[PDB]
Design a protein around this ligand. Structure first.
Ligand SMILES: CCCCCCCCCCCCCCCCCC(=O)OC[C@H](COP(=O)([O-])OCC[N+](C)(C)C)OC(=O)CCCCCCCCCCCCCCCCC
Ligand SMILES: CCCCCCCCCCCCCCCCCC(=O)OC[C@H](COP(=O)([O-])OCC[N+](C)(C)C)OC(=O)CCCCCCCCCCCCCCCCC
Ligand SMILES: CCCCCCCCCCCCCCCCCC(=O)OC[C@H](COP(=O)(O)OCCN)OC(=O)CCCCCCCCCCCCCCCCC
Ligand SMILES: CCCCCCCCCCCCCCCCCC(=O)OC[C@H](COP(=O)(O)OCCN)OC(=O)CCCCCCCCCCCCCCCCC
Ligand SMILES: CCCCCCCCCCCCCCCCCC(=O)OC[C@H](COP(=O)(O)OCCN)OC(=O)CCCCCCCCCCCCCCCCC
Ligand SMILES: CCCCCCCCCCCCCCCCCC(=O)OC[C@H](COP(=O)(O)OCCN)OC(=O)CCCCCCCCCCCCCCCCC
Ligand SMILES: CCCCCCCCCCCCCCCCCC(=O)OC[C@H](COP(=O)(O)OCCN)OC(=O)CCCCCCCCCCCCCCCCC
Ligand SMILES: CCCCCCCCCCCCCCCCCC(=O)OC[C@H](COP(=O)(O)OCCN)OC(=O)CCCCCCCCCCCCCCCCC
Ligand SMILES: CCCCCCCCCCCC(=O)OC[C@H](COP(=O)(O)OCC[N+](C)(C)C)OC(=O)CCCCCCCCCCC
Ligand SMILES: C[C@H](CCC(=O)O)[C@H]1CC[C@H]2[C@@H]3[C@H](O)C[C@@H]4C[C@H](O)CC[C@]4(C)[C@H]3C[C@H](O)[C@]12C
Ligand SMILES: *C(=O)CCCCCCCCCCCCC
Ligand SMILES: [Zn+2]
Lengths: 64, 122, 171, 156, 174, 55, 459, 55, 128, 55, 88, 12
C-alpha cells in the first residue's frame, strides 16, 4: 500500500503530466525532440515502405 | 616495444619512420600485388552508422555483429560467434600492418647494403 | 614559566606517543617504551642544574629530529578528526529567555527548575562579589585561580557559566 | 564613547610617551615595541610577534576560544590574516628551505622527463592504418565534386 | 499541420522491421504495451476533452503585416520623419534576419543529431546553407556596435562596395 | 606490488628501531605542496591586500 | 509618467496628514501600490521605444531601473523603523519625505527624454541624499562623509553641464530621440578629447570608477540603512544609465579614449576585491564589493557591443537587489550588537538559523552562482570582453576567484565558527526583518525564469 | 592530458603509501584513479575512460 | 649532533628549541609575573561583567576598538610622503595600469591589422 | 568490476603511440595501488586489535 | 552515536581495573583514596605513564597542565566524569 | 533517559 501510493503520486501522475506536456506542447514545435535515425543493416525490411535492402555481397569464408 | 632501442640507442635508417610509411613504392618488391578489396559498400556502412574509424576493410563483420546484438535482445550472453569473426578479421588486419612494417624495415637495410657496397667499393 | 621539572615530564609524554606512532604494534611499543624509560632513568636526579639543562636541550633536539611527521592524535583533541565536531550543536542557555511562551508550555517542569537557578544565581551574586574583593590583593588579582566559598550556603565565586556550560554532546 | 586619549596615536618620541602607550595597550613598557617610524601610518600601535593564532595554547581557557584571544588583550595588527582559518605559522617537521628544494626538485625532474618522453614516443611496429575509398574521403566530409587524389592499398 | 515542413525539413523515417532471433521475450515491447494503456490512453482522452472545448469557442489571431516604407537610402538627410520610419523598418528586418539564422542553425543541429555517426557527410546541404547565411548576416550586421542603426549599416555596405568595386577594376585591367 | 607490500608490511612486526628517511616525510606531508602553497600564497595575497591595496 | 509622478508626490501629503502612529503603515502600503502599477511600463516594442510625451519616455533600459527604483522605497521604509523608534514625530515625517522626494527625482531622471532635464534631476538627487546621510547618520564621520559625497559629484557634474549645453548649441537639440538621427561622428582633436572627458567623468565618479571612489566607503558606511540601500542600489546606476545614453554621441572617439578607463576598471576589480579580504568592518566590506561589480559595468559600457550592453543592464539590476540585501543583512546584526566590526559577533547561525539562510542566498548571488541574473549579466560581459581582447579572460577569471573568497569569508566569519560568549542579547529575528530579506531575494530569483525583461534595449 | 594524468596518478598514489587516516588513504586513491582516467583520455580512448567511471 | 632548525617567516622556531626557555634568571621570571599579573587583572575585569546577571548587551572591548581605529582611521594622520611610500605607491599603484595598457593595446593593434587585411578567421563570428 | 575497465586501459596505453615517461608512471602507479590497498587490510583487518578496551 | 554512556560506577571500576594490571602497586593495598607519590611509592615518570594508560582507556587526552594534578584514583574519576558530563 | 536539548527559539 505504501509503495502503491508512492508509485501513483510520484511515477504515474508526473509521467501523465510529462507525456501530456511532451506529446501536445513539445512535439508540436520544430526540432524540439530530435531522435537519431535508426540503424539500417544490409538485409532488412522497412516498415514505412516495405523496401528490402539486398542482403550483402558474399564473404571470403574464413575460420578460427 | 623492443625496437625502441634500435630506433634511439642505435642506427636510425635500420628502423622505419611510422609518420612517413610507406616510403618505397607500393609495387616494387612483389609481382603485381592484388589490391585489397572491401566486402561492404559505402551506402551500407553509412546506413549502419558505423564510426569513422570502423569504416575499414574489417567492416562487414562488425555489421554482422551489430545485427546479432539488436536481433538477440536480451541475449547479451550470446552472439559470441560474430564477435570473433570481426575480432579475427581485425587481428589479420593488424598483422598486415606489421607485415607492412617488416617490409619497410628490411628494404631500408637493403638500401643500406646497396648504397654501402657501391659506395665502399668506389 | 614552567620550572624545570615540568619540561622533562612533558617531553617524556610526547616522546612515548611519537614512539607509539612509529611502532604501531603494541608489543614493539612496550619493548621500546621501557628502553626509552631507561634512558630517562639513567640521568634521574643528578643535580648539577647547569648540566641538567644540557641534557634536556640535547633531548629536545633529538626529539625534534626523530618526531613522527604525522603523530597519532586523539579524535577529540586539537588536530583530531572530531575536534569541535559538536560546537555547532552547543547553544547557550540565555537563549531560553527568548523562547515564546507557547513553546515554554511544552516544558513546564524544566523552566520551573530554571527559575530556581536564576533565582539562586541572583541572590548569590552579591556575596560572590564580596568573596572576590576580600580575597584579592590591593593591586588586583595576580592569578587566574579563584577561591571557593568560605562558608556554608555560599556558592563559589564565578560559577554560573562554569556550571551551566553546554554539554559535550548536546544532541 | 571612548575618548581620544585611549585611542591609538602617533609614534612616541620621548620615553615617557612609550610608557603611556604601553599602559594604554595593556603591555609591559619593556615589551611595548612600536613599528618602525617609516611613515606607512602605523603610529604607536604595538608590534606583536608574527605568530598565528593556530599556534596558541589550545587548552588555555580563552575568552574567545576560536580566536585564541583574551578580552582586553592587544590584538595583532594582522589578526584577521592570522586567524585559525587563513594563515598558519606553526613549526613544521621539515625546515622551510629544505621543503622548497624537495618540492621544486620533484616538479623540475618530472617536467623534464615528460619532455624527454615526448620526443621519444613508444609505439608498436605497424604501418599506418589503411582505410578504403580514398582513405574515407567522402565519409570525412570531402566534397564529392573535386576529384580526390586516388589512394590504393595492396594486400601483403 | 503544427509547422511548415518546407521551412523545417525532415527526411522520411526508416524503421527496420523487428527480426528477433533469440527465443526470449523482449521486455521493451511489453513495457510499450503497458505504457500505451496506463499513460498514453488517459492522456489522449483528457486532451480530446480539452480539444472539444476549444472547438466550442474558436477565436483567431493574425500575423501582423508591415507594408514596406522608404528605406534609409531614399531618406533625405537629417529628415527625422523619413529617417524614423526607415530606421524602424530596418530594426524589424534586423530581428527577422536574426531569426532566419536561428532557423538555419536549428536545421543544422537537427541534422547532426538525426544522422548519427554519419553526420559529417549526410549533413552537407545544411552546413553549406548555414555558412552562406552567416556570411550574409555578418556582412549586413557585424561590427556596427551597440548603437547600431540604418545609417551605420548603410555606411558599412558602401565601404564594402568601394572595396569590392576597386578590386574588380584591378582584376579587369589585369 | 602485493608481494612487495606484504613483505614490507611484515617488517613492521620485526622488533627493531628505524630511521627517519626524508623520502618518507616527503610522502607523509604530501610532497610539501600544501605546507608551502597553502601557507605562502595566502600570506602574499593577504599581505598585499592590506599593505598595498587598502592602506 | 504622470501616472507615477503624481502618486509619488501624493505620498508626501499622505505621510503628513496620517495619524501619528500610522505613518509607517500608510507610506509602506501605498508605496507598494505605486510599485505594482510600475509593471505597466513593460509595454515595450521591438522597434520603437515607449514615448509618452515631449518630456518623458521609457525604453527597455529605463523600465527595469524604474521598477527597481519604485520597489525599493517600501523596502527602505521597513529598514528605517527600528533606528527611528525614539525619533521626534515631525523629524520622522521629514525622513519619509526625503525618501519620497528621492524617488520622485529618480523616476523622472530615468525617463527624461531631454539630456538637460536629465542633468537637473540627476544632480537634484544629491540634496535628499546629502540630507539623509548628514542628519540621520550615527557616527561623527557622517559630516565628513557628506562633504566627500557632495564635492566628488559636483567636481564631475559641473563640466558635464558645460558639455551638454555646448552639444545643444552645435547640434541644436538634446532630445534623445533627435540625437539618434542627428548624431555626427566625433573627430580626433584635443577639443573633442576634453568634450569626451566632460561627458563621462561625471558618470564615472558615480559608478564609481577606481581611483575616484574615495566617497563610497564613507557615504555607504556613515549613511543610515535607508541611505545605504538607495546609495548602492539605484544611485550608482545613474552613472551607468548616463553612460549608456551619452556614448551615442561620442563615437568613434570611444575607441581610444576608453583605454585608460578600461584599465582602471579591469585592474580596479582586483584591487577592490582584494581590499574586501582584509576589511575589519562588515558594512565597509559590502561597500567595496560594489566598486568591483560596477567596474564590470564601466568596461561593459566602454566596449560598445550588443552583448556588453545586455550584460551591463542585467548586472545593474542584479547588483541593486543583491547589494541592497547585503546592507539589510549587515544592519540586522548591527541593530542587536550596535557595532559594525565583523569579528565582534560570530557563529550567528547557531542563534539566528533562518537569518543565516538569507546570508547564504545573498552570498551565492554575490559570487554569481548560475543561473541567477548576477551570473547572466557577468557572463555576458566576459563573453563580450573576450572578443574585445582574449587576455581580459585572465583578469575576469582572477576576480571571480577573489569574489568567491570574500563573499564566503563574511559568511563564515559571522555565521559559522563559535558564538561570542559575552553577546547575550541576540533576540530572534523579527517578522519585519525576515520579510525585508524575502522581498529582495524572491524577485531576484524570479527574474531568472524570465530574464529578457532586464536585458535592455539590445535584446 | 596524458602527462597531467600520469603525474597525478603517480604523485597521489605515492602520497597514499604512508597515510594513517583511513578516509585520507581512500581519498588519495580517488585522485590516482582520476589521473588514470585522464591518461585514458590522453591516449584517445574516451569510451574506456567513461567505462572506468561507471565501474 | 643533529642539524639545527631554520626558522622562516611562516615557520616559527619551536619553543623547546628556543635557547631562552631553559635559562630562567631573576629578572626573566619577574617579567613573566607582570605579564600574568596584568593579563589576570583583565581576566578579572572581563569576568565581573561576563558573569553579572544584571548585564544584557555587549561588553565593549577597548582593545578591539583600538585595533579597528588603528587599521582604518589612524593611518593617514601618521603618513609621511617619503622615498619608500612614494616609490611603493608609484610601483603598486601606477605600474600595473601601465603594464596592462601595453598588453591590451599591443594585443588589439595586432588583431586590428589581421581583420583589415582579412587574415583573421571570422567565418562564423556573428556575435560580438 | 575493475578488470573490465582498468585492464583494457593499460593494454591500450602500452600499445599506443604515447609519451614513454607518462606510460611508465601509469604502470608504476598500478603497482603502487596494491601497496596502499594492502596497507588498509593489514592495519585494519589482520594483526591484533589496537583499539581501546571498551568498544 | 550508539555508544553506551558512562556511569560513575563504570568509570571507577575501569580506573582501578587498569591500575590493578600495573606491576608497580599492590592490588590489596590499592584504594580509591590512595595517593600515587605519598602512599604507593611511585616516581613522577611512572605517574606520567599512569595517565597514558588512563587516556588510552577512555580514548581522550588530558592536558599536561591538568595531567600533573591527578595524584589520587578518585581525582581521575572526577576529571574523566566531569569532562564527559557524567552525573549518575 | 531523554535530556533537554537547548535550541534557539524556533517560534519566530
Ligand atoms: C590566475 C589563476 C587565479 C589566481 C588567483 C588565485 C591564486 C591564489 C591566490 C589567493 C590565495 C589566498 C586566498 C585568500 C585566503 C583564503 C585561504 C586561506 O586563507 O588559507 C586557508 C587554506 C589553508 O588551509 P590548509 O588545509 O592548507 O591548512 C590550514 C591549517 N590547518 C589545517 C591547521 C587548519 O589555504 C588555502 O586553501 C589556499 C590554497 C590555494 C592557494 C594556492 C593556489 C596554488 C595554485 C597552483 C596552480
Ligand atoms: C522552482 C523552479 C521553477 C519552476 C517553475 C518554472 C515554470 C514557470 O513557472 O515559469 C513561468 C514563467 C516563465 O515561463 P515562459 O515565459 O517561458 O512561458 C509561460 C507563459 N507563456 C507560455 C504564456 C509565455 O515565469 C515567469 O515568467 C515569471 C516572471 C517573474 C517576474 C518577476 C518580477 C515580478 C515582481 C516585480 C517586483 C520586483 C521589482 C524589483 C526587481 C526589478 C525588476 C526589473
Ligand atoms: C486598492 C486601492 C485602495 C487601497 C487603499 C490602501 C489600502 C489600505 C492601506 C492599509 C490600511 C491600514 O493601515 O489599516 C488600517 C486599519 C487598522 O486601523 P484601526 O481600524 O484604526 O485599528 C487599530 C487602531 N489602533 O485597518 C482596518 O481597520 C481594516
Ligand atoms: C585635475 C585636472 C583638472 C584640469 C583638467 C581640465 C582642463 C580644462 C581645460 C580644457 C578646456 C577644453 C576646451 O577649451 O574646449 C574648447 C572647445 C572650443 O570649441 P571649438 O570652437 O569647436 O574649437 C575649435 C575652435 N577653433 O570646446 C569644445 O569643443 C568642447 C568643450 C566641452 C567642454 C569642456 C569642459 C572641460 C572639462 C575638463 C575635463 C573634465 C575634468 C573633470 C575634473 C574637473 C576638475
Ligand atoms: C585616479 C585618477 C582617475 C581619473 C583618470 C582620468 C582619465 C585619464 C586621463 C585622460 C586620458 C585620455 C587619453 C590621453 C589623451 C590622448 C588623446 C589621443 O588622441 O590619443 C590617441 C591615441 C592613439 O589613437 P589610436 O590608438 O592610434 O586609434 C585607434 C584606436 N584603436 O590613443 C591612445 O593612445 C589611448 C590613450 C593613451 C593613454 C592611455 C594610458 C593608460 C595609462 C593607464 C591609465 C592611468 C590612469 C591615470 C592614473 C593616474 C595615477
Ligand atoms: C601575469 C599575467 C601576464 C599576462 C601575459 C599576457 C600573455 C599574452 C598571451 O599571448 O597569452 C597567451 C595566449 C596566446 O594566444 P593564442 O591565440 O592562443 O596563440 C598565439 C597568438 N599570438 O593569449 C591568449 O590568446 C589569451 C590566453 C588566455 C589564457 C587564460 C588562462 C586562464 C588560466 C589563468
Ligand atoms: C604540473 C604543473 C603545475 C605544478 C605546480 C606546482 C609547482 C611548484 C614549483 C615548486 C614550488 C616551490 C616553492 C618555491 C617558492 C619558495 C619561495 C620562498 O621560499 O620564499 C619564502 C620567503 C622566505 O623568507 P624568510 O622566511 O624571511 O627566510 C627563510 C629562511 N629560512 O618568505 C616569504 O614568503 C617572503 C616572500 C617571498 C616571495 C617569493 C616568491 C613566491
Ligand atoms: C611617477 C611617480 C614618481 C615618484 C617617485 C619620486 C618621489 C620620490 O622619490 O621621493 C621624493 C620625495 C621624498 O624625498 P625625501 O626627501 O627622501 O623624503 C621627504 C623628507 N622630508 O617625495 C615627497 O616628499 C613628496 C611625495 C612625492 C610625490 C609622490 C606622488 C607619486 C607617488 C604616489 C603614487 C600614487 C598612486 C595613485 C594610484 C592610482 C590608482 C591606481
Ligand atoms: C614497474 C613496477 C615497479 C614496482 C616497484 C616500485 C618501487 C616501490 C617503492 C616503494 C616501496 C614501498 O612500498 O615503500 C613503503 C614506504 C612506506 O611504508 P613503510 O616505510 O614500510 O611504513 C613505515 C615504516 N617505517 C616508519 C619503519 C619506515 O614508502 C615510503 O616510505 C614512501 C616514500 C618513497 C616513495 C617511493
Ligand atoms: C513508500 C515509502 C516506504 C515504504 C516502505 O516501507 O517500503 C514510504 C515511507 C514514508 C512515505 C511518504 C510520507 O508519508 C510523505 C508523503 C505523504 C503520503 O504518505 C503520500 C506521499 C508521501 C511521499 C509518502 C509516500 C510513501 O508512502 C512513503 C515514501
Ligand atoms: C613498446 O612500446 C614498449 C614500451 C614500454 C612498455 C612496456 C614496459 C614493460 C616491459 C616489461 C617486459 C620487458 C621484457 C622482459
Ligand atoms: Zn538599534
Amino acid at each position: 500500500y505504501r509503495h502503491s501510493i508512492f508509485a501513483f503520486t510520484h511515477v504515474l501522475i508526473p509521467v501523465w503530466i510529462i507525456h501530456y506536456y511532451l506529446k501536445y506542447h513539445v512535439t508540436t514545435k520544430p526540432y524540439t525532440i530530435v531522435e537519431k535515425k535508426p540503424r539500417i543493416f544490409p538485409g532488412d525490411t522497412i516498415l514505412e515502405t516495405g523496401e528490402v535492402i539486398p542482403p550483402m555481397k558474399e564473404f571470403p569464408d574464413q575460420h578460427h | 616495444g623492443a625496437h625502441l632501442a634500435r630506433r634511439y640507442l642505435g642506427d636510425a635508417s635500420v628502423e622505419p619512420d611510422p609518420l612517413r610509411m610507406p616510403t618505397f613504392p607500393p609495387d616494387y618488391g612483389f609481382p603485381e600485388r592484388k589490391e585489397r578489396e572491401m566486402v561492404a559498400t559505402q551506402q551500407e556502412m553509412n546506413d549502419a552508422q558505423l564510426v569513422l574509424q570502423q569504416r575499414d576493410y574489417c567492416a562487414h563483420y562488425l555489421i554482422r555483429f551489430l545485427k546479432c546484438k539488436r536481433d538477440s535482445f536480451p541475449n547479451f550472453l550470446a552472439c559470441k560467434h560474430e564477435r570473433h569473426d570481426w575480432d579475427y578479421c581485425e587481428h589479420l588486419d593488424y598483422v598486415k600492418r606489421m607485415k607492412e612494417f617488416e617490409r619497410e624495415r628490411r628494404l631500408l637495410q637493403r638500401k643500406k647494403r646497396r648504397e654501402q657496397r657501391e659506395a665502399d667499393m668506389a | 614559566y614552567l620550572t624545570h621539572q615540568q619540561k622533562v615530564l612533558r617531553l617524556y609524554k610526547r616522546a612515548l606517543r611519537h614512539l607509539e606512532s612509529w611502532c604501531i604494534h603494541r608489543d614493539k611499543y612496550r619493548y621500546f617504551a621501557c628502553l626509552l624509560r631507561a634512558r630517562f632513568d639513567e640521568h634521574k636526579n643528578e643535580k648539577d642544574m647547569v648540566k641538567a639543562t644540557q641534557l634536556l636541550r640535547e633531548a629536545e633536539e633529538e626529539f625534534w629530529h626523530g618526531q613522527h611527521p604525522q603523530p597519532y592524535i586523539f579524535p577529540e583533541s586539537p588536530g583530531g578528526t572530531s575536534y569541535e565536531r559538536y560546537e555547532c550543536y552547543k547553544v547557550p542557555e540565555w537563549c531560553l529567555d527568548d523562547w515564546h511562551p507557547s513553546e515554554k508550555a511544552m516544558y513546564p517542569d524544566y523552566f520551573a527548575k530554571r527559575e530556581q537557578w536564576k533565582k539562586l544565581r541572583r541572590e548569590s551574586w552579591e556575596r560572590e562579589v564580596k568573596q572576590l574583593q576580600e580575597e584579592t590583593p590591593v593591586g588586583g588579582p595576580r592569578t587566574e585561580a579563584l577561591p571557593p566559598a568560605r562558608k556554608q550556603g555560599d556558592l563559589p565565586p564565578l560559577w554560573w557559566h562554569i556550571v551551566t556550560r553546554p554539554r559535550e554532546r548536546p544532541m | 564613547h571612548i575618548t581620544k586619549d585611549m585611542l591609538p596615536g602617533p609614534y612616541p618620541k620621548t620615553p615617557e610617551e612609550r610608557a603611556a602607550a604601553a599602559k594604554k595597550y595593556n603591555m609591559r613598557v619593556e615589551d611595548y615595541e612600536p613599528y618602525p617610524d617609516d611613515g606607512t601610518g602605523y603610529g604607536d600601535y604595538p608590534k606583536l610577534p608574527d605568530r598565528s593564532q593556530q599556534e596558541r595554547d589550545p587548552w588555555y581557557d580563552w575568552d574567545h576560544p576560536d580566536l585564541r584571544l583574551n578580552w582586553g588583550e592587544p590584538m595583532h595588527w594582522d589578526l584577521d590574516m592570522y586567524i585559525r582559518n587563513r594563515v598558519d605559522t606553526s613549526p613544521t617537521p621539515v625546515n622551510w628551505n629544505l621543503m622548497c628544494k624537495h618540492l621544486f626538485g620533484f616538479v623540475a625532474f618530472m617536467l623534464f622527463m615528460f619532455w624527454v618522453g615526448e620526443t621519444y614516443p613508444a609505439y608498436q611496429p605497424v604501418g599506418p592504418k589503411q582505410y578504403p575509398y580514398n582513405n574515407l574521403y567522402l565519409e570525412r566530409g570531402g566534397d564529392p565534386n573535386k576529384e580526390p587524389e586516388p589512394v590504393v592499398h595492396y594486400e601483403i | 499541420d503544427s509547422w511548415d515542413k518546407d521551412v523545417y525539413p525532415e527526411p522520411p523515417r526508416r524503421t527496420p522491421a523487428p527480426s528477433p532471433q533469440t527465443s526470449l521475450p523482449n521486455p521493451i515491447t511489453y513495457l510499450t504495451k503497458a505504457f500505451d494503456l496506463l499513460v498514453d490512453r488517459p492522456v489522449t482522452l483528457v486532451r480530446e476533452f480539452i480539444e472539444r472545448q476549444h472547438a466550442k469557442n474558436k477565436y483567431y489571431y493574425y500575423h501582423r503585416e508591415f507594408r514596406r516604407v522608404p528605406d534609409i537610402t531614399e531618406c533625405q538627410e537629417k529628415d527625422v520623419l523619413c529617417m524614423f520610419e526607415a530606421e524602424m523598418q530596418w530594426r524589424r528586418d534586423y530581428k527577422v534576419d536574426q531569426e532566419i539564422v536561428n532557423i538555419i542553425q536549428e536545421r543544422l543541429k537537427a541534422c547532426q543529431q538525426r544522422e548519427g555517426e554519419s553526420h559529417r557527410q549526410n549533413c552537407a546541404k545544411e552546413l553549406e546553407q548555414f555558412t552562406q547565411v552567416v556570411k550574409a548576416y555578418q556582412d549586413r550586421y557585424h561590427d556596427l556596435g551597440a548603437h547600431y542603426s540604418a545609417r551605420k549599416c548603410l555606411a558599412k555596405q558602401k565601404q564594402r562596395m568601394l572595396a569590392e568595386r576597386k578590386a574588380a577594376k584591378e582584376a579587369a585591367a589585369a | 606490488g602485493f608481494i612487495l607490500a606484504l613483505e614490507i608490511s611484515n617488517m613492521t612486526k620485526n622488533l627493531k628501531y628505524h630511521y627517519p628517511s626524508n623520502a618518507f616525510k616527503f610522502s607523509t606531508l604530501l610532497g610539501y605542496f600544501p605546507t608551502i602553497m597553502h601557507r605562502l600564497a595566502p600570506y602574499m595575497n593577504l599581505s598585499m591586500s592590506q599593505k598595498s591595496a587598502s592602506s | 509618467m504622470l501616472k507615477y509622478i503624481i502618486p509619488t508626490i501624493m505620498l508626501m501629503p499622505l505621510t503628513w496628514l496620517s495619524k501619528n502612529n500610522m505613518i509607517w503603515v500608510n507610506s509602506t502600503a501605498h508605496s507598494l501600490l505605486i510599485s505594482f502599477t510600475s509593471l505597466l511600463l513593460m509595454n515595450q516594442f521591438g522597434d520603437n521605444s515607449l514615448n509618452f510625451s515631449l518630456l518623458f519616455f521609457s525604453d527597455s533600459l529605463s523600465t527595469p531601473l524604474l521598477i527597481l527604483t519604485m520597489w525599493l522605497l517600501p523596502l527602505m521604509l521597513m529598514a528605517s523603523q527600528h533606528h527611528l523608534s525614539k525619533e521626534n514625530l515631525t523629524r520622522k515625517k521629514l525622513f519619509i519625505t526625503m525618501l519620497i522626494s528621492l524617488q520622485l527625482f529618480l523616476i523622472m531622471t530615468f525617463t527624461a527624454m531631454e539630456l538637460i532635464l536629465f542633468y537637473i534631476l540627476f544632480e537634484a538627487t544629491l540634496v535628499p541624499t546629502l540630507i539623509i546621510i548628514t542628519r540621520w547618520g550615527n557616527q561623527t564621520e557622517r559630516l565628513n562623509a557628506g562633504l566627500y559625497f557632495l564635492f566628488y559629484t559636483l567636481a564631475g557634474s559641473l563640466p558635464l553641464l558645460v558639455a551638454l549645453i555646448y552639444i545643444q548649441n552645435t547640434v541644436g537639440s538634446l532630445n534623445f530621440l533627435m540625437l539618434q538621427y542627428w548624431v555626427q561622428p566625433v573627430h580626433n582633436s584635443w577639443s573633442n578629447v576634453f568634450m569626451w572627458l566632460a561627458c563621462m567623468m561625471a558618470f564615472m565618479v558615480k559608478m564609481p570608477l577606481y581611483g575616484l571612489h574615495l566617497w563610497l566607503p564613507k557615504a555607504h558606511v556613515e549613511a543610515p540603512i535607508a541611505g545605504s540601500m538607495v546609495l548602492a542600489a539605484v544611485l550608482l546606476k545613474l552613472g551607468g544609465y548616463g553612460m549608456l545614453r551619452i556614448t551615442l554621441i561620442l563615437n568613434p572617439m570611444t575607441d581610444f579614449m576608453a583605454y585608460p578607463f578600461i584599465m582602471l576598471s579591469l585592474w580596479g576589480m582586483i584591487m577592490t576585491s582584494s581590499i574586501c579580504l582584509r576589511q575589519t568592518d562588515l558594512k565597509s566590506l559590502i561597500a567595496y564589493s560594489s566598486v568591483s561589480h560596477m567596474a564590470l559595468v564601466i568596461v561593459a559600457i566602454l566596449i560598445q557591443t550588443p552583448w556588453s550592453y545586455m550584460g551591463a543592464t542585467a548586472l545593474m539590476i542584479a547588483h541593486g537587489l543583491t547589494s541592497s540585501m547585503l546592507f539589510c543583512l549587515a544592519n540586522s546584526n548591527y541593530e542587536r550588537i550596535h557595532s559594525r566590526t565583523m569579528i565582534l559577533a560570530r557563529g550567528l547561525q547557531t542563534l539566528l538559523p533562518l537569518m543565516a539562510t538569507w546570508w547564504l542566498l545573498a552570498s551565492l548571488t554575490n559570487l554569481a552562482l548560475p543561473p541567477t541574473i548576477n551570473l547572466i549579466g557577468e557572463l555576458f560581459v566576459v563573453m563580450s570582453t573576450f572578443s574585445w581582447s582574449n587576455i581580459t579572460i585572465i583578469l575576469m577569471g582572477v576576480n571571480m576567484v577573489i569574489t568567491a573568497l570574500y563573499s564566503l569569508y563574511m559568511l563564515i566569519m559571522t555565521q559559522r565558527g563559535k558564538y561570542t560568549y559575552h553577546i547575550n542579547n541576540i533576540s530572534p529575528s523579527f517578522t519585519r526583518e525576515n520579510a525585508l530579506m524575502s522581498l529582495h531575494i524572491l524577485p531576484l530569483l524570479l527574474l531568472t525564469l524570465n530574464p529578457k525583461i532586464i536585458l535592455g534595449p539590445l535584446y | 592530458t596524458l602527462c597531467l594524468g600520469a603525474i597525478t596518478t603517480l604523485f597521489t598514489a605515492m602520497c597514499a603509501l604512508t597515510q594513517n587516516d583511513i578516509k585520507k588513504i581512500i581519498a588519495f586513491s580517488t585522485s590516482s584513479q582520476l589521473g588514470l582516467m585522464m591518461v585514458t583520455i590522453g591516449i584517445n580512448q574516451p569510451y574506456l575512460a567513461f567505462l572506468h567511471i561507471c565501474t | 649532533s643533529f642539524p639545527k632548525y631554520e626558522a622562516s617567516r611562516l615557520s616559527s622556531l619551536p619553543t623547546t628549541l628556543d635557547p631562552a626557555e631553559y635559562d630562567i634568571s631573576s629578572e626573566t621570571r619577574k617579567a613573566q609575573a607582570e605579564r600574568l599579573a596584568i593579563r589576570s587583572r583583565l581576566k578579572r575585569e572581563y569576568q565581573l561583567q561576563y558573569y553579572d546577571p544584571s548585564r544584557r548587551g555587549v561588553i565593549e572591548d577597548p582593545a578591539l576598538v583600538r585595533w579597528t581605529y588603528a587599521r582604518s582611521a589612524n593611518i593617514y594622520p601618521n603618513f609621511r610622503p617619503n622615498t619608500k611610500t612614494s616609490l611603493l605607491g608609484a610601483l603598486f599603484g601606477i605600474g600595473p595600469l601601465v603594464f596592462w595598457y601595453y598588453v591590451f593595446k599591443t594585443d588589439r593593434d595586432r588583431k586590428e591589422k589581421l581583420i583589415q587585411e582579412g587574415k583573421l578567421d571570422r567565418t562564423f563570428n556573428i556575435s560580438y | 568490476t575493475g578488470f573490465y575497465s582498468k585492464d583494457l586501459i593499460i593494454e591500450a596505453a602500452n600499445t599506443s603511440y604515447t609519451n614513454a615517461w607518462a606510460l611508465l608512471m601509469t604502470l608504476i602507479a598500478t603497482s603502487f595501488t596494491a601497496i596502499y590497498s594492502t596497507r588498509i587490510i593489514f592495519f585494519a583487518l589482520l594483526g591484533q586489535p589496537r583499539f581501546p578496551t571498551l568498544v | 552515536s550508539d555508544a553506551p554512556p558512562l556511569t560513575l560506577e563504570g568509570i571507577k571500576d575501569r580506573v582501578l581495573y587498569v591500575l590493578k594490571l600495573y606491576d608497580k602497586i599492590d592490588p590489596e593495598k590499592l584504594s580509591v583514596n590512595s595517593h600515587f607519590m605519598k602512599d604507593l611509592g611511585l616516581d613522577s615518570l611512572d605517574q606520567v605513564e599512569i595517565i597514558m594508560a588512563m587516556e588510552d582507556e577512555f580514548g581522550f587526552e588530558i592536558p599536561d597542565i591538568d595531567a600533573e594534578k591527578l595524584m589520587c584514583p578518585q581525582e581521575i574519576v572526577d576529571y574523566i566524569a566531569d569532562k564527559k558530563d557524567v552525573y549518575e | 533517559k531523554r535530556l533537554f536539548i537547548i535550541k534557539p527559539s524556533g517560534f519566530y
